[PDB]
């Protein structure tokens, strides 16, 4: 019945983790920065500097 959906009787909180590493390279260094090429702004709204 929809009561279970509405009353949150059977609902689970699920958490995932996403690792990402910037490492040294012969090309130089990879930067964790907002200087991201060719991107819009509505998708840049929710990022810190």
């Amino acid at each position: 019945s929809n009561r279970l959906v509405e009353e949150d009787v059977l609902t689970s909180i699920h958490i995932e983790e996403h690792e990402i590493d910037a490492r040294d390279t012969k090309l130089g260094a990879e930067e964790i920065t907002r200087d991201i090429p060719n991107i819009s702004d509505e998708v840049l709204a929710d990022l810190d500097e």
Partner: protein
Amino acid sequence: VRLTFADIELDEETHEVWKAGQPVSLSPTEFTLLRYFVINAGTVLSKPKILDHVWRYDFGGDVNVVESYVSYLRRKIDTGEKRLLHTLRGVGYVLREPR
């Protein structure tokens, strides 16, 4: 909007440079090389992609031209034997304050 690094400073409008506060006159293409160096500060520069982006793709000359141009950049601003414009063997050059 002027782009600065250590003791070299650039104004994007009238294409001149200050070295430690002293204005310096420099050649146009040599200035484009310096513009590449500052626009990719801290990242190593290799002769090929330097040739690819800065220079026209029609360049049929030899490879000594870029080495000579780096020599001019050295004798103009980094006159010291050890210089902020370090060179990598087979990997080219880089703008970096020495540690």
